Amino acid sequence: VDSLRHSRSRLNIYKALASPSLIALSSEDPFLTAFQLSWELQELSKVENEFKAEYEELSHQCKHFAKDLLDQTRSSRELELILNFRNELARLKLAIKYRQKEFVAQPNCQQLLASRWYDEFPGWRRRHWAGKLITCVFIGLMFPLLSLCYLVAPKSRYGLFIRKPFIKFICHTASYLTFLFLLLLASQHIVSNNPDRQGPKPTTVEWMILPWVLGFIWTEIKQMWDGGFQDYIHDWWNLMDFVMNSLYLATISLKIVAYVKYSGCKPRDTWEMWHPTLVAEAVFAIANIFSSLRLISLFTANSHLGPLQISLGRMLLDILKFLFIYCLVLLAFANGLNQLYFYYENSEGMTCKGIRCERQNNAFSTLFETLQSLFWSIFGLISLYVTNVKADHKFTEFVGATMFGTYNVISLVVLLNMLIAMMNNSYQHIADHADIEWKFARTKLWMSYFEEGGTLPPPFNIIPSPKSICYLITWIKVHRAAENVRLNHQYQEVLRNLVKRYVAAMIRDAKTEEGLTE
Amino acid sequence: RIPLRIVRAESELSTQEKSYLSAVEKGDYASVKLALEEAEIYFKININCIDPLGRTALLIAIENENLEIIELLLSFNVYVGDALLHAIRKEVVGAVELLLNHKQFSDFTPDITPIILAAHTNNYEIIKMLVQKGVSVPQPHEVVDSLRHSRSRLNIYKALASPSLIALSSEDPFLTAFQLSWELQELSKVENEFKAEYEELSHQCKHFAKDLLDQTRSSRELELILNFRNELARLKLAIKYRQKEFVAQPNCQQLLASRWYDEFPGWRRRHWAGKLITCVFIGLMFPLLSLCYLVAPKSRYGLFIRKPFIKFICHTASYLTFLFLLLLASQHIVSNNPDRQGPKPTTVEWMILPWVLGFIWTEIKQMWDGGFQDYIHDWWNLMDFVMNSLYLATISLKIVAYVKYSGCKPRDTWEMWHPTLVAEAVFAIANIFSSLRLISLFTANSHLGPLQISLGRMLLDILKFLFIYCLVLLAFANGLNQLYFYYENSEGMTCKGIRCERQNNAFSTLFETLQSLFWSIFGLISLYVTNVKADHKFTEFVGATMFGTYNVISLVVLLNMLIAMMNNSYQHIADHADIEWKFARTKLWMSYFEEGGTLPPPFNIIPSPKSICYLITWIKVHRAAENVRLNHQYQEVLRNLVKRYVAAMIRDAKTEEGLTEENFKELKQDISSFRYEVIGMM
Amino acid sequence: ENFKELKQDISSFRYEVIGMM
Amino acid sequence: RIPLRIVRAESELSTQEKSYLSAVEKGDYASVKLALEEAEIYFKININCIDPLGRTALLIAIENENLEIIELLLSF
Ligand SMILES: CCCCCCCCCCCCCCCC(=O)OC[C@H](COP(=O)(O)O)OC(=O)CCCCCCCCCCCCCCC
Ligand SMILES: CCCCCCCCCCCCCCCC(=O)OC[C@H](COP(=O)(O)O)OC(=O)CCCCCCCCCCCCCCC
Ligand SMILES: [Ca+2]
Ligand SMILES: [Ca+2]
């Protein structure tokens, strides 16, 4: 009934709640309160988009409180108590879920996480890059042996060696590189079948590819289950994985269909369009591109290519908005050019029609062909003589050439440079939080390799376990801890000490370090 | 809703405790004395009470700069605890004086000792009075509780890298600053979680060195500083430790330029025309100067090439002569005929040969006198190594072709991988590298120098970006080859690939796909390479869509991201443009100060007067009282510079500051204590 | 330096007043 | 480890010197006049003493904007 008073009062009682002093004097767990409150303020900056800025600032403040409350730790045992509070590292996973980038990227958190990342490799900081490279290649090369040992004897001196997060990250990376090299071999004439064969009866390389595909699909299914479907799609790499595995499923199904419907062989030139085998090769090639692009996500692990890859991923949204505007410009000029040129569509003579031919014939004679012509015009791949017709109509040709020239001016010397300008503005800010965001991403990647589940790489992922039927049959068959209180009190003492230190060192001394006004 | 209650704030103060702490706040000496004397007959006060936010009575008096109340409180035996540490952290010299001679929760990490915290504050008076007592700081190692260990190491490196502590101790502050900056730089690699912090510390050390050298008032004293242990030894040491600010100090550069010319008074007041004429003049007679230094290296002209600028001009002239010889090597007027296997090298190549041998000899000498780690730190040195390897390959391949192909036949009929053909190829690549070795001679120029250095400083971001682009390229190459390898065609065409008039198979092999996608980013691949000799419009459309998506990703997304990253890089790089360029120019200049490496490469390979004495003997292996005098004279110089530095950047720079809220609180407290005294004594 | 001057003026004022009464 | 000792900071002040320089710091005209008049019968004070960071009595009074003490010090 009074929107102004209501919104203002809500802002006033959220700015009060998100106060380090009030969170320190009250709120049994300041860490949980800070996380929840930052999340709530972030959501309100979407709901209340007129006060968005203000709410965002408040949210940010909460985040720093968490960080600055964790910087008051003086011991690794106390910090471990803070981070392992309710399998393990539970409070850190909670921080990851609430997107507390500053809390995660705190130096002591990262130091503890790296110590848990190596677990058998004292050094790797004082070691020279040569020995690092040799040993990573070495362990990657014998990834299948390590996985085999974990299959058969997952308790020996070698079966537990893959249990170490860095070792199993190397093993998964090696298995993925093996997969990609198999995709490369799939396009070599030395290990392929002949092209004049409908229903190819898949070769040895494709057979070896198949276990990787099944393992990838199984891993994606497990992620979709253990984590839900909302958090699953928040990662764009997960969407790319879903598309990749859908495409590989399509490849398998189309190959199967072609094998059970096309038992004959005939030269490929005479095949008909939309042949199941042809579509199978097409979708397999698209899936190959996506599989090989899934290799850029393994650079969050690298301190040199990590911040860069994260920042490039952070510029994409501006690219998408700009490309939406460009698509509208493209559609406008396509509509105009097609309207001008569709009366002179020509077939007699030429045997290949379109712009994908040596002599680029009809380029604006259909809307689809116009769209392709205007797309390839921005890379200079459309010649200037496509604006002509087989008549002496110099006026229509001149008008068409002027539409085409205006489209090139708008897109190549106006919009493209505006894109450069917007990207520069974006990268000014993005590079400020480059280390924080990259360390958040690397923490997510690292933490994905801390669990016992998902230890074997995909080729060995699909192996009937020792039971293999016990957790399979039973899964569908649905249709006195006094340590808890002790842990809670010990955490309470830790938290008391941290809040005391925080009040002393950032409320009492930081206020003193100020600038006196009039 | 939300009832609010106190948590984790247990202790609250009685009325007497609040009154006594408020008296200590206001500076009321009479009230504090009264409450403290009433704290011994019948205590009932808890003399060591703690206010909210901690802030004990002794600590309150410390925060108020009230020395009278501090002496009184100590006279009544209060628990000082960390009083010394809060006094030091606040830079309170009087309280530090009182608490230094006086016979669980804390605001300080238990590894913090008084001297460490004092050195953190960089206050010279407190550090001075702590050192006299006999404190010491732990020594960390070269380079169970990870948090405590890392934090303690950082605390004792931030203390060590303190201008006040380096000035009060450390017999040679210059050596200490150099070594400490180097150590902190290495630790910013080992301890990559605290990297930033260590880097900042390292930077601070560097400035100390610079600001300790800015306190020189005489060129003789500065020469003593820089020539300390042939000559300019301490400057070479600064170069080795990468002390860019120390090297780029204006007085260092002025002295270095004076040693750079040595016969050319002027060159600052001279017009560019005379400069150009005389440089061309001396370059033109470089061979005569080198000849004189060969035969009579003591005459009025044999010593003329000994001057660093003259010999830099001579080396540049010899290099330009070499490059012009490479240009002549590709002219049909001074070459042999192409239909000749085993060419029997022409006159131009013969004249090229001494330059090649001299270049190889120079690179060998650099690899020796300087080691192999410092040698490869320079990228120009790697380029030189590749260049000379390529020229060695050229000579060897020409020799092989001369002793295996004595016949002549038309070139069109030659076979691939012919030694002569490979010789020409590697020679051409070496020509490119030789001609690119000419960009390094622009660090000597004040206009093209900072630019060339900055462009060299952007390359690393280019390499990271190009690694990402290579992955994108490999992804789309894999996809396109997978789509197109079934339509590989041979019948008809006689030239296959994209390097032909009618660009045939472009994605039919992985190598050809890689080339197609590489040349696609310059628009040199036509659109009709995505077609096949069949009516399969679906596969052609899918291939054209892979190709179009690759062009969108690479030409309008990645390329612009590269522009953005380069812009961000160049914002920062251009800030330290002069400093880095002057460092690079100092390195270039200093490379021409020695007696070794004086003759240019064509004359470098000449049997010396002995030519066998240092050759035979080199393999046959299988009472200086001036030193102490130099050391003491340097010590006096260093004493004066440290005195000046303390006076002019510790005493005056601290004064030039901005007063915080604590200064207003101190002023108010002084007025209140004055008020209470006056009212109480009348 | 201005805060130091102010503090010094107050202290000298204080010493005069205390010493003359 | 790393025992720390004073280098290149030779001169240290006696108790009377510190008291007199502290009086000049605080602006104490009576104490400075007394110590300066006791610096002529039996000197034992080194009227021109130098504090750490230099900062001589005259220079101290200059830094404190105290003109009365400056006139007195010049008068002696
Ligand atoms: C440095 C790069 C500068 C880019 C070029 C600037 C154009 C300068 C004028 C060129 C004229 C010379 C040709 C004359 C002969 C002729 O008739 O040629 C006309 C030419 C080509 O036609 P012909 O080949 O048939 O002659 O076409 C054009 O010149 C069209 C230019 C229009 C410019 C539009 C710019 C408006 C900005 C866009 C707004 C941004 C958002 C829009 C999205 C909704
Ligand atoms: C101002 C410059 C703007 C650049 C152009 C924007 C593209 C707009 C859409 C064009 C569509 C028109 C053609 C329609 C007909 C057709 O089918 O044509 C499709 C065309 C060409 O195919 P055809 O010639 O066979 O028709 O191909 C494409 O359109 C592909 C566009 C995909 C865009 C990808 C952008 C994603 C950003 C990359 C992420 C960065 C990192 C990635 C590395 C891992
Ligand atoms: Ca996934
Ligand atoms: Ca070299």
Residue numbers in the entry:
A (entry chain C): 187 to 272, 284 to 676, 694 to 732
B (entry chain B): 17 to 119, 135 to 174, 187 to 272, 284 to 676, 694 to 753
C (entry chain A): 733 to 753
D (entry chain A): 17 to 92
Quote the paper:
To be able to identify CaM-induced structural effects, we also solved the structure of TRPC4 in its apo state under the same conditions as for the TRPC4-CaM complex without the addition of external lipids. The apo structure of TRPC4 in LMNG reached a resolution of 2.85 Å, allowing us to build an atomic model with high accuracy. The overall structure is similar to the previously reported amphipol-exchanged apo structure of TRPC4 in the closed state. However, in both the apo and CaM-bound structure, we observed for the first time an additional density corresponding to a horizontal helix located at the transmembrane-cytoplasmic interface outside the transmembrane core (residues 666–676). The hydrophobic residues of this helix face the transmembrane helix and the inner lipid leaflet while the hydrophilic residues project into the cytoplasm, giving the helix an amphipathic nature. Comparing the TRPC4 apo structure with that of TRPC4-CaM, we could identify only small differences in the center of the channel. Both, the apo and CaM-bound TRPC4 structures showed the same constriction of 0.7 Å defined by N621 at the lower gate indicating the closed state of the channel. The differences between TRPC4-CaM and the TRPC4 apo structure are more pronounced at the periphery of the channel.
